[PDB]
Structure formats: C-alpha cells, structure tokens
C-alpha cells in the first residue's frame, strides 16, 4: 500500500535571495521597507545564517518517512513537504503527489498545537487543492502536543537543565513554556490553541517535577489587532517582580526546530532581558531531527491511522 506523507510547516527561506519575498508573504502582501529588510537580514546573520534552518525541515520529513516505513510493513510512505510561506507551497506539494500517482495521503503539521490560523489553515489549503485536482484524499493530524513520546523529549531536557544548575538557582527558578502568538481574535471561534499550550506546559512542568512555571507567547506580528499575550519579554519581567526569580528556563514547545523565532526572539531577546536583570538564561535543545522526536512523530502518524 502506497500513501503520501504530506509534512507541512511555516517555512524558512532556503536562501537570503528569498528573505524579501518570504517576509512579504508573512505580512500578507505588504513588502518590507528597506530598513526592515536590512534589520531582518542582520538577525539571520547574528544567529549564524539562514541556510542551516531550511535544511532541518527537509531532514525532519525525510527521517520521518524512513522511520515510518521501518517500523511497520503494511504501508509504504513517500514524503512531500508543503510550506505555508515559501516554495514548495502546500498547493505545489499536493500537485506533486497527484502527479506521482498518489491517491491517499496522511498529513501532519510541524506545530504540535492546533490553531485556526496555523494547523487548520494548512489542512484546509491541502484538502481544497486535492479536491481541485480530483482523486486524492488526505486525512490530517490536528494536534499532537499530548503525544507521550513528545512530552518525554521536553521533560528529559528540562530535567537535565535543572540538574545542570547551581543549587541556588534550582530553588529560585522559573519555567516559561511558549509558542507563536496569534491574533487575539482566534478566541471568537473557540480556538483551543491557548488551552493546548497551557496543557503542554503543565504536562512538561509536572513530568519534570516543576511547581513554578508560566505560559507566554512570542514572535507576534505587528497589526492593529491585539495578539495573544503576555509576550515572553514582558512575562519574564513581571515574574521577576512578583517573586524575583534567579534563573529562567525557556521551552518554546510550539516550535520544533532552531529558527529565527528561537535563536533570536529567545536566545537574544529573552537573554537581553535575563542578562539585564542578572537572572540566568537557559533554553534546552530544540527537537530538530533527533531520533527521539522523529519516533514520537511516527507514533502520532500511525496512531492517527489506527495502529
Ligand atoms: C504588516 C502586516 C503584518 N500582518 C498583516 C499586515 C498588514 C495588515 C495591517 O496591518 O493592516 C496582516 C495579517 N496578518 C495576519 C492576518 C490575519 C492579517 C490580516 C490580513 C488581511 O489584510 O486580511 C495573520 C498573521 N500574521 C502573522 C502570522 S503568524 O506568523 O502565523 O503568527 C499570522 C497568523 C505574522 C506577521 N504579520 C506581520 C508580521 S511583522 O510585524 O513581523 O512584519 C508578522 C511576523 C505583519
Ligand atoms: Mg519580534
């Protein structure tokens, strides 16, 4: 049995040549002004370049198809990447599947929390393009933050981080678990996105044994509408002022890979804030394409299919 494996993600530019069109796409067609563009470029430079980041999704999708075809023998999976904000787009991935003769696919988004703006939008764009082309069906994973193998990944890293600490810090530490902020209007549709982030943080804090943790949001866009808050920078400060913590540990659980939203908005922006206040900054390794994470994903996909 052959099945397409449609792996979807937000996307990151493969080359600097694409930073401009990437950002224009995110800004819903509004082209960056030259100084904004330069600012962006400088950020990617500071984190060591854009090229490494794109490759991680490629390796994630490839490892997942491989481990999927390794662990069972009734389905042969073939992976297709479809990205929201850069080529190959979701629609081009479905088009390729159809060309290769695929009639049934399973899709998964590389974002463990369901939202209307992210997961649902991707799943719908995929299904609508399958329907336009005819004779291809897609069953879509909606959320997987609660998969135990995925909780275990983050719990072990948090445990290792607290274990590595000075004794002084362990007893005066704060866990901040976060994901990408979205327009506050999502709550008009009862979007469970904020609740699922709360549940993630609890699952991970409790598995790690952590009584003190908070949920924050990051990497918000600039629009006239309110976005989900508090932002991690304001939360880190409010927390250092209701209780004066000495170490802050950041688990960007909404992100699966090293990209700008982590390497910059956490390791720079939040680290600017901890350094200032002389609390310590910790941020454990992102899952990227480590075996333990890909196994969790394979399990999510098989569970979805009824195995
Ligand atoms: C400048 C701009 C941005 N975003 C928009 C504008 C122009 C509209 C206006 O402000 O009047 C527009 C939208 N972004 C949206 C939505 C639903 C709109 C309205 C579209 C319309 O005009 O109908 C959603 C949205 N946006 C972003 C995401 S997320 O990454 O998935 O979280 C999502 C779901 C991301 C961003 N949007 C941004 C920026 S940035 O300030 O960094 O340049 C970012 C990082 C900026
Ligand atoms: Mg920002």
Curated annotation (Swiss-Prot):
Null mutant: what phenotype?
Deletion mutant requires hemin for growth.
CDD domains, per the entry: Ferrochelatase_C, Ferrochelatase_N
> Pathway membership of this protein?
Porphyrin-containing compound metabolism; protoheme biosynthesis
Q: Where does Fe-coproporphyrin III bind?
A: 10, 27, 43-44, 51, 122
Q: Explain the purpose of this protein.
A: Involved in coproporphyrin-dependent heme b biosynthesis. Catalyzes the insertion of ferrous iron into coproporphyrin III to form Fe-coproporphyrin III. It can also insert iron into protoporphyrin IX. Has weaker activity with 2,4 disulfonate, deuteroporphyrin and 2,4 hydroxyethyl. In vitro, can also use Zn(2+) or Cu(2+).
Transmembrane segment boundaries: none
Task: Tell me the Gene Ontology biological-process terms attached to this UniProt entry.
Answer: heme biosynthetic process
Species annotation: Bacillus subtilis (strain 168)
GO molecular-function terms, A-Z: ferrochelatase activity; metal ion binding
Which InterPro entries does this UniProt record tie to the protein? Ferrochelatase (IPR001015), Ferrochelatase_AS (IPR019772), Ferrochelatase_C (IPR033644), Ferrochelatase_N (IPR033659)
Which NCBIfam families does the UniProt record give?
A: hemH, PRK12435.1
Main EC class the enzyme belongs to: lyase
Family assignment from sequence similarity:
Belongs to the ferrochelatase family.
The UniProt record gives the binding positions of Mg(2+) as 17, 43, 265, 269
The record's listing under Pfam families reads: Ferrochelatase
Keyword vocabulary terms for this entry: Cytoplasm, Heme biosynthesis, Iron, Lyase, Magnesium, Metal-binding, Porphyrin biosynthesis
Positions with a binding annotation for N-methylmesoporphyrin: 10, 28-30, 180, 185
Q: Which GO terms describe its cellular component?
A: cytoplasm
Q: What PROSITE patterns is this protein classified in?
A: FERROCHELATASE
Q: Which residues of this UniProt protein bind Fe(2+)? A: 180, 261
Catalysed reactions, as listed in the record = Fe-coproporphyrin III + 2 H(+) = coproporphyrin III + Fe(2+)
Outcome when changing residue 10 to M: Changes the metal specificity of the enzyme. Can insert Co(2+) into protoporphyrin IX at a higher rate than the wild-type enzyme, but loses the ability to insert Cu(2+) and Zn(2+)
Q: What is this protein called?
A: Coproporphyrin III ferrochelatase
């Amino acid at each position: 049995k052959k099945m397409g494996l449609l792996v979807m993600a937000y996307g990151t530019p493969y080359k600097e040549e694409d930073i401009e069109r990437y950002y224009t796409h995110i800004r819903r067609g509004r082209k960056p002004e030259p100084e904004m563009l330069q600012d962006l470029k400088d950020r990617y430079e500071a984190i060591g370049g854009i090229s490494p980041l794109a490759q991680i999704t490629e390796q994630q999708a490839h490892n997942l198809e491989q481990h999927l075809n390794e662990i069972q023998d009734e389905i042969t999976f073939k992976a297709y990447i479809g990205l929201k904000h850069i080529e190959p787009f979701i629609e081009d991935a479905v088009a390729e599947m159809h060309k290769d003769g695929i009639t049934e696919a399973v899709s998964i988004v590389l974002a463990p929390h369901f939202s209307t703006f992210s997961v649902q939008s991707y799943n719908k764009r995929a299904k609508e393009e399958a329907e336009k082309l005819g004779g291809l069906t897609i069953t879509s994973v909606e959320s997987w933050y609660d998969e135990p193998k995925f909780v275990t990944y983050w719990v072990d890293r948090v445990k290792e981080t607290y274990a590595s600490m000075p004794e002084d810090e362990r007893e005066n530490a704060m866990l901040i678990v976060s994901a990408c902020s979205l327009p506050e209007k999502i709550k008009e549709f009862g979007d469970p996105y904020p609740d699922q982030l709360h549940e993630s943080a609890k699952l991970i804090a409790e598995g790690a044994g952590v009584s003190e943790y908070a949920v924050g949001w990051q990497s918000e866009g600039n629009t006239p509408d309110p976005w989900l808050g508090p932002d991690v920078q304001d939360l880190t400060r409010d927390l250092f002022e209701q209780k004066g913590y000495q170490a802050f540990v950041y688990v960007p659980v909404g992100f699966v890979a090293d990209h700008l939203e982590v390497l910059y908005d956490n390791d720079y922006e939040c680290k600017v804030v901890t350094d200032d206040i002389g609390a310590s900054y910790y941020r454990p390794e992102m899952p990227n394409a480590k075996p333990e994470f890909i196994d969790a994903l394979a399990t999510v996909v098989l569970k979805k299919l009824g195995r």
